[PDB]
Structure formats: C-alpha cells, structure tokens
Amino acid sequence: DNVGLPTPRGSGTSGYVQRNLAHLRPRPDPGLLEHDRKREVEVKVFELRDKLEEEGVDEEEIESRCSELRQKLLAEMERNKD
Amino acid sequence: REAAVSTVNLLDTIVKCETKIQTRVKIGLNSKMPSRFPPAVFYTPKELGGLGMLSGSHILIPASDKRWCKQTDVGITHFRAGMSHDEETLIPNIARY
Amino acid sequence: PGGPRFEPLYKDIDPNDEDFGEFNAMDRIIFRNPIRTETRVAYPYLYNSRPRSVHLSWHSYPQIVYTKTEDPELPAFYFDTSINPISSRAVAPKNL
Amino acid sequence: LEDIPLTLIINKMDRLILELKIPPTDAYFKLKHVIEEVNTVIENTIPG
Amino acid sequence: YSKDNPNLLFSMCGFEVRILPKCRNQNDEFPVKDSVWSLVDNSTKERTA
Amino acid sequence: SHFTESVLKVAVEPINPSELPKMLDGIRKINKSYPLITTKVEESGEHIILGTGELYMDCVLHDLRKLYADMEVRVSDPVVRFCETVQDMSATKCYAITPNKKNTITMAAEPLDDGIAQDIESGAVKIKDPPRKVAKFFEEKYGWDKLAARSIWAFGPDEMGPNILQDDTLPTEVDKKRLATVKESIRQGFAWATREGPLCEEPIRNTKFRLIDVSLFPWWWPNYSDRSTCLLFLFLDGLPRLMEPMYSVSMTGPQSSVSMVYNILSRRRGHVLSDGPIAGTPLYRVNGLIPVIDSFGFETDLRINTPGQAMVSLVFDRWSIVPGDPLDREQVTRPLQMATAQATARDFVLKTRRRKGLSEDVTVAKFLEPEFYQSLLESGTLGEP
Amino acid sequence: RLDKRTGKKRDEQLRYTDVHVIERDRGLSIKAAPMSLVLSSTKGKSHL
C-alpha cells in the first residue's frame, strides 16, 4: 500500500491515500504383472533358501532345491497364466 | 477531453496550477490562511461578485460554509442547507460538462 | 500506521526510470500474500534493496504475565482466575 | 541424540514471586511441571 | 507491431495513442473507459480494437 | 549435522556491476561466518543465498552489505527451495539407448512409502553398512521383498539422500558381470539425475527405482547422459508433483491472539494442529503448520494485528506436496496476481523453471529417444505436442 | 564502571557475550560466544 506522493509539500493536495474501495477484487501393463509373478517366485525361492540355511543344510542341495523350485514356479505360472 | 481525464500527470499539473492561481490571489491580499479563503471566494460566479473560477480539481465545500441567518419580524432564524448530512458537496469538475 | 511522515531521505530510486532489467523481471516473481510496509521496516535488510541509514530495532521481549489485581482485598500471592491451572495429570511423569 | 550429557537450569524464579504471584505450593507445582516437561521430551527422544 | 509485440504506439496532434486489437488480448476482462477507443471494422461493423 | 535446513532462498546481485568481484568476496565471508548458509551460482548467473528464516537472512544481508563486501547489493524477493516427488506407479517401463545404440536401460519409478525417507535422512539406514543389515532392517520394518532388499543398489543424490536405486531384474535374462560394470556408471547417473531433477532441476525426494528385464548391456559405456535422460522421463510419466518446505508455527500468547492465529493461518494456507493453555500461566500455546513461501511477513502481521502481544517461532518441519498439478498446461495465472488453489503448482514450476534459465515448457521430447517418443505418442500415453 | 551509568542505560542488561552490532541492536544473540572463567566450588576449589 506504498503508492503515491512521497511528500504532499510540493503539491496543494494533502495526499490522503485511500484503498479505492470500488475496485473489483479478483474472482495397466501385463509386463508389470509378469514381473510381479517373477518377483513372487523369487521371493518363494529366497524363503526356501533362508529355510535351508536356518536348518544347516548344504549349499549344493539348497541350490538344487532352489533351482527345482524355480522351475516348478515357472511351470505353474505357465499353466495358470490363463 | 477523455485523453485528459485518463492522464495522472496532467491532473496533478492541473491541481498544482490551480493552486498557484489561488496562491497568486492570496498573495495579492498579503495572506495565505486557508480558512480566510473558502471555496466560495474563488468559485462563486462573477454575477454574485465572485471570481468565477472553473475547477478541474476536486475540492470539498465544508458544512461550516453552508449556513445563513435572516432577520424576520419575529427575530433571527438560522437556516442551514443539508440538514444532518455528514457528506460535503464538492466543486463540480469541468471535465464532466 | 499512526507514525510520522518525512521528506524522502534518498530521492534516487524510482521504478519508471529503470527499464526492463533481468533481476526484477515481473513474472519471475512467485507472488503470494503481499508483503506490507511494516514487514519492510521490521526486516529492513531482507525486504529492501537499498536499506541505507536504517536502524535495527529490538526484536522481542519476554512476555509479561503480570496482571494487576482488580479486587482491593486479595493477598499478594494467590492463584488468579486468569492463570491456567496445573493438574495432577498435567504434570504426570509418564515413565518411572 | 548426540549422547551429550545434559543438566537443567530453571531460570527466572523471581517471576513466580513477582509476575505470576502464585503461592509457594503452586510454585512447586509449576517447577515440577516444567521438570516433567523436560523429562517428557527427553523420554520422547529415546523411548525406554 | 509484430508476432510478439501486440501494441501499436504513436503520437499525433497532442494525443499519445496505444492501439490494441481485440484478438491478441490476454486480458479477458476489458477495463474500457471513455479514453479507450473501440475501433470498428466496417466490413463486419465489429469492434476489433 | 545440523538439526534444521536452510529452505529460504534469496537471489542477490551487485547494484554497481563493476563491484561484482567484491560482493563475491563478501559472499565467501558470509559462508565463513554462518554455518548453515549455502551459496550458489546458477546457470542464469544470479547469485543464490540459502538460509533458515527472516531474521537469519536479515542478519546475513546486514553482514554482507555493511561488514564484508561494504557495498550496495540488490536483493530479490524471498523465495523457497523446492523438491519433487511422484504420486503413483509407473505407466510405462522406460528405456535409454546410447548413441552407438547398444546399451538399453529399462527402468521404472515408484513413490516410496512414508517413513523410509526420514529414516535415510536420520542415518538409521547406512549405505556403508553390510547389505545383510540393511535387508534385515527393511524386512523387519517395512516388509519388503528379500531379493528387493538385497538388490537395493544405492541412495541418492548423496549417500544420505531419500532416493533409492534398486535392482528388480532377473538373472535369467540379464547377466550380472556386465550389470555391475554398467551399474557403476548407473549409480553415477542416478546421483546426477536425482541431484538435478527434470521439472525445475530442483533436487528430488522420496522416489524408488526398479531395474527391469529386457534391458541389454553390451560392452562398454563411458557416458552418463542417456540413462539419466530416461530417468527424468520416468519422473515425467510417474505423475510427478512439486514439494515445498513447511514451517511449524508455535505461538505463546493470550486467547485473542489464538483467534487471530486461526484467522491469519486460514488466510495463509496454514493449519492449526493443536491449541491449549500453558499450565501455571495466563498464556496459551498454539501449534500448527505453514508453507515457507506463505510465511513471509507472517510473524510481523501476527505480532501487529493483535490486541495482546504474541510471540512467533517458525521452525522447518516438513516437505509437503504443493496443491495442484505441475504438468497441467491449461492452468494459467495472470501477471501481478497470486495463483489459485489448483494452479499453484503450475505457477511454481513455471516461474522456478525460467527463474533458473530454461525454456517455458517441460520438454518431453528433449528427454526421450525419438523412436520411443513416437511409440508413446502412437500408444496414447503422452499428450498432444 | 556499571554503576557510573545514568539514565535508561543503567537499566540495561549487561549482556557481556553479545558483542555483534546486530546483537546489540536486536537485543538477542546471533552467534556462539565462548568464555574461559575461574569459578569456585562450595568446598573452595577453583576450576576452569
């Protein structure tokens, strides 16, 4: 509201400033599903690997079981894709 | 005309020049007292003895300069225009005419 | 608001003389609720580009919680009704 | 959080006598309230 | 007046004139006062500026 | 490790251009005397000073004008830092192609859940830690996938930033040794992309990235631009939003001051979280939130327009999503005017974007391969150019 | 030398570690302020 007349001394105005109160104020990808199924199969494989590691089983048998589980999960996904 | 009413610098110049003309009139009387020279001194038409000045400014006429008394056979009666009206009439703008 | 007015200390800066400069470009500013002149006075070095001969003022004081007693025969030390109470569940050490 | 040892200084005690003008029991309750507020914030920083 | 300067400026016989057409106007509301001139196209009799 | 952030931004320049050296020297002294200040030189050439509040920047500009530089410094209107985020899942798996057209990078963007970003910023999750500890933390707190938890590659823009780059590919389709050799530069491009960001090159927060199969990585890549270009387009098609800092308003003061706090906070896009009495005093405490860009002059207005005397404390609290859509082209704002409720984000993005020296449009085609851009135009996933 | 002080100036707080001109004019501290003092305990042992 700093508008007009730095001093009223020069003019014969006495510059009382007003607000001008008559102024108008403003008025799905199937690839994502395939990736989710692959992630679920990988999560199942990781859970099986963690269960094998918790039981103290050998690494080769755990790897073979994980490969068999991954193949079974892929076959199940291919069978139940429809 | 309408180009003149829309120029702020021109309106400021008109206000200052009208003030300078009235200041010349006041200096001719060795005074600059604002109460000594009401708007009736300048803007009364020449027929009533006034100066007959026209205004392009916006000048208030106070309610203090709105009273007149008359001595009739029953005594003194003070008449007043604008009974209980807190607004003041303004000097007309020439651009409106 | 309510204060005096003086002549301009520096009669130099005026936006009409300055042409279309890059720093104060009109639509590079992200206008919000408008800054008032009291905010310009309170923080003169942040809100003015040429704050020459400005004086930094006292920022704040601690709030005075003293209230003068209306009743003429109350003691000097009393729990006033305008003072919010302290409850037993307000203190409440939550873990001990 | 930075595991810096902390001590408490309750300041401006004269206010309890001269500004609030509350009786000494209520001044105790105000002090205990401020102390338990500090301890509440300390506990809320590290729970348990 | 060009692709990206929509105002026409001149001065004549005392009057400083800025012509703005009613085609390249960003102002959807018109603050038309007595000073502002509606320039009428005769072939359509339509206020175009 | 400071416990608040400098989210108030002021652009400065010299008034006399020939004294542009001296102010810079003074700016250096500012950076030596104020620990939480950050100084920057933009691409546009204006100088940027970032501090915490009105009083902080008032003191800093006093020290710059009167103590160190000893000149007259033109100072712009105060503005805020901005960040960006994404709202929902990725519409398309997006890929980057090298100029030799061998390496192809396929990636998706995700909004991170609430609690991860503040945990990375607080140091609860360390990238220097062994990945088993990080995986255990994510499993025990947010219940992620174990392969996903072990496949979290990096944090960005730095090792403390709230952006996560993570593998989600399969070993059956992508070999791992070439994956690592490209993954080094992938982390570098991730760091530079999340440091810049696509919208206004404001550093971007709270995003997760999943690597995707079919992405093939042949021999050698010394460049960084293509993966980050695709990654910015992944910000574009994940419905990005703008984010602004948020002060926490704290008042002590009487009841009329409380009512005035509701009034002014209602007028300044602010909320009142709580209100109550301070026990044992005639004072009342009001806690709330305000945007930093809407808090300019808030303390002065609240201290003046009140019968009693109100004290105000404004502390940086939050990063919050700006209301509105940043990519909505039809939302326009008049000059001299404040943006409306839904055009706020668009106005912020446009003016922050060309304050920093860019084009007026968020260039989709400049951040895409031509074949992928034409394919997405034909598929309808992108708007009309 | 504080008792050789007249007017409103003798009612001012000393504020020894506020030395910035901003600190003097704003009436608040803006900078950290170190001192090293010799203070005595209850038993009489001076510590630094």
mmCIF file of all heavy atoms in Angstrom, chain F residues 97-139:
data_model
loop_
_atom_site.group_PDB
_atom_site.id
_atom_site.type_symbol
_atom_site.label_atom_id
_atom_site.label_comp_id
_atom_site.label_asym_id
_atom_site.label_seq_id
_atom_site.Cartn_x
_atom_site.Cartn_y
_atom_site.Cartn_z
ATOM 1 N N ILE F 97 18.765 -45.507 -24.708
ATOM 2 C CA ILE F 97 19.550 -46.028 -25.822
ATOM 3 C C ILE F 97 20.752 -45.116 -26.035
ATOM 4 O O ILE F 97 20.606 -43.889 -26.091
ATOM 5 C CB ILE F 97 18.704 -46.128 -27.107
ATOM 6 C CG1 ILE F 97 17.513 -47.066 -26.901
ATOM 7 C CG2 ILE F 97 19.543 -46.602 -28.282
ATOM 8 C CD1 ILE F 97 16.508 -47.027 -28.031
ATOM 9 N N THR F 98 21.937 -45.717 -26.153
ATOM 10 C CA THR F 98 23.170 -44.976 -26.370
ATOM 11 C C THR F 98 23.246 -44.447 -27.805
ATOM 12 O O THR F 98 22.488 -44.886 -28.674
ATOM 13 C CB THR F 98 24.368 -45.876 -26.072
ATOM 14 O OG1 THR F 98 24.259 -47.087 -26.831
ATOM 15 C CG2 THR F 98 24.420 -46.211 -24.602
ATOM 16 N N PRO F 99 24.125 -43.467 -28.070
ATOM 17 C CA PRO F 99 24.368 -43.069 -29.470
ATOM 18 C C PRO F 99 24.884 -44.194 -30.353
ATOM 19 O O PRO F 99 24.564 -44.217 -31.548
ATOM 20 C CB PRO F 99 25.399 -41.941 -29.336
ATOM 21 C CG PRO F 99 25.117 -41.349 -28.015
ATOM 22 C CD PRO F 99 24.730 -42.501 -27.132
ATOM 23 N N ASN F 100 25.670 -45.126 -29.814
ATOM 24 C CA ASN F 100 26.053 -46.301 -30.588
ATOM 25 C C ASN F 100 24.939 -47.340 -30.656
ATOM 26 O O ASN F 100 25.082 -48.325 -31.390
ATOM 27 C CB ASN F 100 27.341 -46.926 -30.025
ATOM 28 C CG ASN F 100 27.282 -47.185 -28.524
ATOM 29 O OD1 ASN F 100 26.281 -47.661 -27.993
ATOM 30 N ND2 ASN F 100 28.373 -46.869 -27.834
ATOM 31 N N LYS F 101 23.852 -47.129 -29.903
ATOM 32 C CA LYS F 101 22.641 -47.956 -29.935
ATOM 33 C C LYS F 101 22.932 -49.411 -29.575
ATOM 34 O O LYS F 101 22.449 -50.340 -30.223
ATOM 35 C CB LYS F 101 21.932 -47.848 -31.287
ATOM 36 C CG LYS F 101 21.537 -46.422 -31.642
ATOM 37 C CD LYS F 101 20.534 -46.374 -32.781
ATOM 38 C CE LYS F 101 20.042 -44.953 -33.007
ATOM 39 N NZ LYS F 101 18.878 -44.901 -33.933
ATOM 40 N N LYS F 102 23.732 -49.607 -28.528
ATOM 41 C CA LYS F 102 23.999 -50.931 -27.988
ATOM 42 C C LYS F 102 23.362 -51.116 -26.616
ATOM 43 O O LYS F 102 22.530 -52.009 -26.434
ATOM 44 C CB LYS F 102 25.513 -51.175 -27.910
ATOM 45 C CG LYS F 102 26.234 -51.056 -29.240
ATOM 46 C CD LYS F 102 27.738 -50.976 -29.041
ATOM 47 C CE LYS F 102 28.447 -50.577 -30.324
ATOM 48 N NZ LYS F 102 29.880 -50.252 -30.087
ATOM 49 N N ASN F 103 23.709 -50.267 -25.651
ATOM 50 C CA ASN F 103 23.189 -50.396 -24.298
ATOM 51 C C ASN F 103 21.753 -49.892 -24.232
ATOM 52 O O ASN F 103 21.443 -48.801 -24.720
ATOM 53 C CB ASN F 103 24.061 -49.620 -23.312
ATOM 54 C CG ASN F 103 25.483 -50.141 -23.249
ATOM 55 O OD1 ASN F 103 25.713 -51.328 -23.026
ATOM 56 N ND2 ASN F 103 26.447 -49.252 -23.450
ATOM 57 N N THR F 104 20.882 -50.691 -23.622
ATOM 58 C CA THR F 104 19.493 -50.319 -23.398
ATOM 59 C C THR F 104 19.183 -50.506 -21.923
ATOM 60 O O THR F 104 19.396 -51.592 -21.375
ATOM 61 C CB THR F 104 18.544 -51.163 -24.256
ATOM 62 O OG1 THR F 104 18.970 -51.120 -25.624
ATOM 63 C CG2 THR F 104 17.125 -50.631 -24.161
ATOM 64 N N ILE F 105 18.687 -49.452 -21.282
ATOM 65 C CA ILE F 105 18.406 -49.471 -19.846
ATOM 66 C C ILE F 105 16.903 -49.338 -19.648
ATOM 67 O O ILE F 105 16.303 -48.349 -20.078
ATOM 68 C CB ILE F 105 19.160 -48.357 -19.100
ATOM 69 C CG1 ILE F 105 20.629 -48.740 -18.924
ATOM 70 C CG2 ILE F 105 18.527 -48.090 -17.733
ATOM 71 C CD1 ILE F 105 21.401 -47.805 -18.026
ATOM 72 N N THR F 106 16.295 -50.320 -18.988
ATOM 73 C CA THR F 106 14.866 -50.311 -18.718
ATOM 74 C C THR F 106 14.636 -50.142 -17.221
ATOM 75 O O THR F 106 15.232 -50.851 -16.404
ATOM 76 C CB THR F 106 14.193 -51.593 -19.219
ATOM 77 O OG1 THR F 106 14.622 -51.861 -20.558
ATOM 78 C CG2 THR F 106 12.683 -51.422 -19.227
ATOM 79 N N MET F 107 13.766 -49.197 -16.874
ATOM 80 C CA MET F 107 13.655 -48.701 -15.511
ATOM 81 C C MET F 107 12.206 -48.298 -15.254
ATOM 82 O O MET F 107 11.455 -47.977 -16.190
ATOM 83 C CB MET F 107 14.622 -47.520 -15.311
ATOM 84 C CG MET F 107 14.749 -46.926 -13.911
ATOM 85 S SD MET F 107 15.422 -48.037 -12.676
ATOM 86 C CE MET F 107 17.129 -48.064 -13.207
ATOM 87 N N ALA F 108 11.814 -48.347 -13.973
ATOM 88 C CA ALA F 108 10.525 -47.834 -13.520
ATOM 89 C C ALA F 108 10.687 -47.034 -12.235
ATOM 90 O O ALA F 108 11.609 -47.268 -11.445
ATOM 91 C CB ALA F 108 9.500 -48.945 -13.265
ATOM 92 N N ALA F 109 9.741 -46.118 -12.020
ATOM 93 C CA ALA F 109 9.702 -45.212 -10.882
ATOM 94 C C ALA F 109 8.539 -45.565 -9.961
ATOM 95 O O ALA F 109 7.484 -46.020 -10.411
ATOM 96 C CB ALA F 109 9.556 -43.760 -11.345
ATOM 97 N N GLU F 110 8.744 -45.349 -8.660
ATOM 98 C CA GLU F 110 7.755 -45.656 -7.643
ATOM 99 C C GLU F 110 7.807 -44.584 -6.563
ATOM 100 O O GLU F 110 8.896 -44.074 -6.267
ATOM 101 C CB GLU F 110 8.019 -47.038 -7.028
ATOM 102 C CG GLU F 110 7.020 -47.504 -5.972
ATOM 103 C CD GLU F 110 5.625 -47.727 -6.525
ATOM 104 O OE1 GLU F 110 5.497 -48.005 -7.735
ATOM 105 O OE2 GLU F 110 4.654 -47.621 -5.746
ATOM 106 N N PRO F 111 6.671 -44.203 -5.979
ATOM 107 C CA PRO F 111 6.710 -43.378 -4.761
ATOM 108 C C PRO F 111 7.051 -44.235 -3.551
ATOM 109 O O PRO F 111 6.417 -45.263 -3.305
ATOM 110 C CB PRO F 111 5.291 -42.806 -4.670
ATOM 111 C CG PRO F 111 4.450 -43.744 -5.463
ATOM 112 C CD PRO F 111 5.323 -44.247 -6.571
ATOM 113 N N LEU F 112 8.069 -43.815 -2.803
ATOM 114 C CA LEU F 112 8.423 -44.507 -1.571
ATOM 115 C C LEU F 112 7.330 -44.339 -0.525
ATOM 116 O O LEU F 112 6.640 -43.317 -0.478
ATOM 117 C CB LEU F 112 9.752 -43.989 -1.026
ATOM 118 C CG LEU F 112 11.014 -44.535 -1.685
ATOM 119 C CD1 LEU F 112 12.226 -43.748 -1.235
ATOM 120 C CD2 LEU F 112 11.169 -45.996 -1.318
ATOM 121 N N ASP F 113 7.173 -45.359 0.314
ATOM 122 C CA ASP F 113 6.208 -45.301 1.397
ATOM 123 C C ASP F 113 6.687 -44.336 2.479
ATOM 124 O O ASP F 113 7.855 -43.938 2.528
ATOM 125 C CB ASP F 113 5.978 -46.696 1.978
ATOM 126 C CG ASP F 113 5.293 -47.630 1.000
ATOM 127 O OD1 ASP F 113 4.521 -47.140 0.149
ATOM 128 O OD2 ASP F 113 5.531 -48.853 1.079
ATOM 129 N N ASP F 114 5.762 -43.944 3.348
ATOM 130 C CA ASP F 114 6.088 -42.990 4.399
ATOM 131 C C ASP F 114 6.923 -43.659 5.483
ATOM 132 O O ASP F 114 6.579 -44.740 5.971
ATOM 133 C CB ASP F 114 4.810 -42.404 4.994
ATOM 134 C CG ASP F 114 4.159 -41.383 4.080
ATOM 135 O OD1 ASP F 114 4.894 -40.674 3.361
ATOM 136 O OD2 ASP F 114 2.913 -41.291 4.079
ATOM 137 N N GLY F 115 8.025 -43.012 5.860
ATOM 138 C CA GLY F 115 8.909 -43.495 6.898
ATOM 139 C C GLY F 115 10.291 -43.891 6.422
ATOM 140 O O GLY F 115 11.223 -43.915 7.235
ATOM 141 N N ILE F 116 10.457 -44.199 5.135
ATOM 142 C CA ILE F 116 11.767 -44.611 4.639
ATOM 143 C C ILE F 116 12.677 -43.402 4.449
ATOM 144 O O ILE F 116 13.853 -43.432 4.834
ATOM 145 C CB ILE F 116 11.635 -45.435 3.338
ATOM 146 C CG1 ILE F 116 10.895 -46.761 3.563
ATOM 147 C CG2 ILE F 116 12.998 -45.727 2.734
ATOM 148 C CD1 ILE F 116 9.392 -46.717 3.376
ATOM 149 N N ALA F 117 12.143 -42.321 3.866
ATOM 150 C CA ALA F 117 12.953 -41.149 3.542
ATOM 151 C C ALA F 117 13.508 -40.480 4.794
ATOM 152 O O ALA F 117 14.692 -40.119 4.840
ATOM 153 C CB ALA F 117 12.124 -40.156 2.729
ATOM 154 N N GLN F 118 12.676 -40.323 5.826
ATOM 155 C CA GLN F 118 13.153 -39.751 7.077
ATOM 156 C C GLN F 118 14.080 -40.697 7.827
ATOM 157 O O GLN F 118 14.873 -40.235 8.652
ATOM 158 C CB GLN F 118 11.974 -39.362 7.968
ATOM 159 C CG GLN F 118 10.964 -38.445 7.298
ATOM 160 C CD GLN F 118 9.694 -39.171 6.906
ATOM 161 O OE1 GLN F 118 9.425 -40.272 7.383
ATOM 162 N NE2 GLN F 118 8.907 -38.558 6.032
ATOM 163 N N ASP F 119 14.002 -42.003 7.561
ATOM 164 C CA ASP F 119 14.945 -42.935 8.170
ATOM 165 C C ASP F 119 16.310 -42.868 7.497
ATOM 166 O O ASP F 119 17.340 -42.997 8.169
ATOM 167 C CB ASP F 119 14.394 -44.360 8.116
ATOM 168 C CG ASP F 119 13.451 -44.661 9.262
ATOM 169 O OD1 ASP F 119 13.441 -43.889 10.244
ATOM 170 O OD2 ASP F 119 12.722 -45.672 9.184
ATOM 171 N N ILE F 120 16.340 -42.684 6.175
ATOM 172 C CA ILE F 120 17.618 -42.489 5.496
ATOM 173 C C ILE F 120 18.225 -41.143 5.875
ATOM 174 O O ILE F 120 19.441 -41.030 6.075
ATOM 175 C CB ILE F 120 17.459 -42.631 3.970
ATOM 176 C CG1 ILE F 120 16.792 -43.957 3.615
ATOM 177 C CG2 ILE F 120 18.811 -42.556 3.282
ATOM 178 C CD1 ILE F 120 16.257 -43.999 2.203
ATOM 179 N N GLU F 121 17.392 -40.102 5.986
ATOM 180 C CA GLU F 121 17.910 -38.784 6.341
ATOM 181 C C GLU F 121 18.396 -38.725 7.785
ATOM 182 O O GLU F 121 19.291 -37.934 8.101
ATOM 183 C CB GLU F 121 16.849 -37.712 6.094
ATOM 184 C CG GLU F 121 16.880 -37.129 4.689
ATOM 185 C CD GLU F 121 15.668 -36.273 4.383
ATOM 186 O OE1 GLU F 121 14.615 -36.480 5.021
ATOM 187 O OE2 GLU F 121 15.768 -35.392 3.503
ATOM 188 N N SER F 122 17.828 -39.543 8.673
ATOM 189 C CA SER F 122 18.256 -39.562 10.068
ATOM 190 C C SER F 122 19.455 -40.467 10.315
ATOM 191 O O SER F 122 19.956 -40.503 11.444
ATOM 192 C CB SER F 122 17.101 -39.995 10.973
ATOM 193 O OG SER F 122 16.868 -41.390 10.872
ATOM 194 N N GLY F 123 19.925 -41.194 9.304
ATOM 195 C CA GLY F 123 21.048 -42.088 9.484
ATOM 196 C C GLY F 123 20.709 -43.449 10.044
ATOM 197 O O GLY F 123 21.626 -44.190 10.416
ATOM 198 N N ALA F 124 19.423 -43.799 10.129
ATOM 199 C CA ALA F 124 19.041 -45.119 10.621
ATOM 200 C C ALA F 124 19.442 -46.218 9.646
ATOM 201 O O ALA F 124 19.759 -47.335 10.069
ATOM 202 C CB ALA F 124 17.538 -45.166 10.890
ATOM 203 N N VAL F 125 19.429 -45.927 8.348
ATOM 204 C CA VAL F 125 19.874 -46.855 7.316
ATOM 205 C C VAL F 125 21.150 -46.292 6.707
ATOM 206 O O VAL F 125 21.154 -45.171 6.182
ATOM 207 C CB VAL F 125 18.797 -47.067 6.241
ATOM 208 C CG1 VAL F 125 19.329 -47.956 5.129
ATOM 209 C CG2 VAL F 125 17.544 -47.662 6.857
ATOM 210 N N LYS F 126 22.229 -47.065 6.775
ATOM 211 C CA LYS F 126 23.527 -46.650 6.265
ATOM 212 C C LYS F 126 23.876 -47.457 5.024
ATOM 213 O O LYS F 126 23.738 -48.684 5.009
ATOM 214 C CB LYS F 126 24.618 -46.829 7.325
ATOM 215 C CG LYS F 126 24.168 -46.521 8.745
ATOM 216 C CD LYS F 126 25.340 -46.086 9.612
ATOM 217 C CE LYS F 126 24.863 -45.394 10.879
ATOM 218 N NZ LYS F 126 25.929 -45.328 11.917
ATOM 219 N N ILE F 127 24.330 -46.761 3.979
ATOM 220 C CA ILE F 127 24.741 -47.446 2.760
ATOM 221 C C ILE F 127 26.144 -48.030 2.905
ATOM 222 O O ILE F 127 26.514 -48.941 2.153
ATOM 223 C CB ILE F 127 24.634 -46.487 1.558
ATOM 224 C CG1 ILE F 127 24.604 -47.258 0.234
ATOM 225 C CG2 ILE F 127 25.771 -45.473 1.560
ATOM 226 C CD1 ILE F 127 23.372 -48.121 0.062
ATOM 227 N N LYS F 128 26.924 -47.556 3.879
ATOM 228 C CA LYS F 128 28.222 -48.144 4.179
ATOM 229 C C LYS F 128 28.108 -49.428 4.988
ATOM 230 O O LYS F 128 29.100 -50.154 5.115
ATOM 231 C CB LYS F 128 29.093 -47.138 4.935
ATOM 232 C CG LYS F 128 29.629 -46.006 4.075
ATOM 233 C CD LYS F 128 30.444 -45.028 4.905
ATOM 234 C CE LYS F 128 31.198 -44.045 4.024
ATOM 235 N NZ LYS F 128 31.528 -42.789 4.752
ATOM 236 N N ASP F 129 26.929 -49.716 5.536
ATOM 237 C CA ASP F 129 26.706 -50.937 6.283
ATOM 238 C C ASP F 129 26.695 -52.139 5.340
ATOM 239 O O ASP F 129 26.505 -51.986 4.131
ATOM 240 C CB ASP F 129 25.385 -50.845 7.047
ATOM 241 C CG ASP F 129 25.554 -50.263 8.436
ATOM 242 O OD1 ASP F 129 26.704 -50.188 8.916
ATOM 243 O OD2 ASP F 129 24.535 -49.882 9.049
ATOM 244 N N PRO F 130 26.936 -53.341 5.865
ATOM 245 C CA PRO F 130 26.757 -54.558 5.062
ATOM 246 C C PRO F 130 25.321 -54.692 4.587
ATOM 247 O O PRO F 130 24.387 -54.297 5.301
ATOM 248 C CB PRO F 130 27.128 -55.682 6.041
ATOM 249 C CG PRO F 130 28.085 -55.048 6.978
ATOM 250 C CD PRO F 130 27.636 -53.622 7.134
ATOM 251 N N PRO F 131 25.104 -55.227 3.379
ATOM 252 C CA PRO F 131 23.735 -55.284 2.836
ATOM 253 C C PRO F 131 22.812 -56.226 3.587
ATOM 254 O O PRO F 131 21.588 -56.086 3.463
ATOM 255 C CB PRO F 131 23.937 -55.739 1.384
ATOM 256 C CG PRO F 131 25.317 -56.293 1.305
ATOM 257 C CD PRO F 131 26.078 -55.958 2.549
ATOM 258 N N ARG F 132 23.351 -57.175 4.358
ATOM 259 C CA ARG F 132 22.504 -58.032 5.183
ATOM 260 C C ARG F 132 21.797 -57.232 6.270
ATOM 261 O O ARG F 132 20.617 -57.466 6.547
ATOM 262 C CB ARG F 132 23.334 -59.158 5.798
ATOM 263 C CG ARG F 132 23.824 -60.185 4.792
ATOM 264 C CD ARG F 132 24.539 -61.333 5.482
ATOM 265 N NE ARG F 132 24.989 -62.343 4.531
ATOM 266 C CZ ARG F 132 25.708 -63.408 4.854
ATOM 267 N NH1 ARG F 132 26.078 -63.640 6.103
ATOM 268 N NH2 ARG F 132 26.064 -64.264 3.901
ATOM 269 N N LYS F 133 22.500 -56.275 6.885
ATOM 270 C CA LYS F 133 21.889 -55.436 7.915
ATOM 271 C C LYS F 133 20.795 -54.545 7.336
ATOM 272 O O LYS F 133 19.725 -54.392 7.939
ATOM 273 C CB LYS F 133 22.961 -54.588 8.596
ATOM 274 C CG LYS F 133 22.526 -53.957 9.906
ATOM 275 C CD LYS F 133 23.643 -53.115 10.501
ATOM 276 C CE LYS F 133 23.163 -52.332 11.712
ATOM 277 N NZ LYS F 133 23.958 -51.089 11.915
ATOM 278 N N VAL F 134 21.049 -53.954 6.165
ATOM 279 C CA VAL F 134 20.059 -53.104 5.506
ATOM 280 C C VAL F 134 18.838 -53.923 5.102
ATOM 281 O O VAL F 134 17.689 -53.491 5.284
ATOM 282 C CB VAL F 134 20.703 -52.399 4.295
ATOM 283 C CG1 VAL F 134 19.696 -51.518 3.582
ATOM 284 C CG2 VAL F 134 21.912 -51.587 4.736
ATOM 285 N N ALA F 135 19.071 -55.120 4.555
ATOM 286 C CA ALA F 135 17.974 -56.006 4.182
ATOM 287 C C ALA F 135 17.163 -56.430 5.399
ATOM 288 O O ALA F 135 15.930 -56.471 5.342
ATOM 289 C CB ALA F 135 18.520 -57.230 3.447
ATOM 290 N N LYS F 136 17.839 -56.738 6.511
ATOM 291 C CA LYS F 136 17.144 -57.104 7.742
ATOM 292 C C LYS F 136 16.304 -55.949 8.271
ATOM 293 O O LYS F 136 15.176 -56.158 8.734
ATOM 294 C CB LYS F 136 18.157 -57.556 8.793
ATOM 295 C CG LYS F 136 17.540 -58.091 10.075
ATOM 296 C CD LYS F 136 18.619 -58.519 11.056
ATOM 297 C CE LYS F 136 18.030 -58.910 12.400
ATOM 298 N NZ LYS F 136 19.093 -59.194 13.403
ATOM 299 N N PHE F 137 16.838 -54.725 8.206
ATOM 300 C CA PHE F 137 16.088 -53.551 8.646
ATOM 301 C C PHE F 137 14.833 -53.351 7.802
ATOM 302 O O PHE F 137 13.742 -53.120 8.340
ATOM 303 C CB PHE F 137 16.986 -52.311 8.595
ATOM 304 C CG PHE F 137 16.389 -51.091 9.251
ATOM 305 C CD1 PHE F 137 16.644 -50.814 10.586
ATOM 306 C CD2 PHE F 137 15.599 -50.206 8.530
ATOM 307 C CE1 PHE F 137 16.105 -49.692 11.194
ATOM 308 C CE2 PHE F 137 15.056 -49.085 9.131
ATOM 309 C CZ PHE F 137 15.312 -48.827 10.463
ATOM 310 N N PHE F 138 14.968 -53.451 6.474
ATOM 311 C CA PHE F 138 13.803 -53.266 5.609
ATOM 312 C C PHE F 138 12.777 -54.382 5.782
ATOM 313 O O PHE F 138 11.569 -54.119 5.766
ATOM 314 C CB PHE F 138 14.225 -53.135 4.146
ATOM 315 C CG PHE F 138 14.680 -51.752 3.770
ATOM 316 C CD1 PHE F 138 16.011 -51.480 3.503
ATOM 317 C CD2 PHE F 138 13.761 -50.717 3.682
ATOM 318 C CE1 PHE F 138 16.415 -50.201 3.158
ATOM 319 C CE2 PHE F 138 14.159 -49.439 3.338
ATOM 320 C CZ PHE F 138 15.488 -49.181 3.076
ATOM 321 N N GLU F 139 13.230 -55.630 5.959
ATOM 322 C CA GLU F 139 12.292 -56.725 6.193
ATOM 323 C C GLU F 139 11.562 -56.566 7.522
ATOM 324 O O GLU F 139 10.349 -56.794 7.599
ATOM 325 C CB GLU F 139 13.013 -58.074 6.152
ATOM 326 C CG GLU F 139 13.526 -58.480 4.784
ATOM 327 C CD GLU F 139 12.421 -58.645 3.767
ATOM 328 O OE1 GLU F 139 11.370 -59.226 4.109
ATOM 329 O OE2 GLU F 139 12.608 -58.186 2.623
#
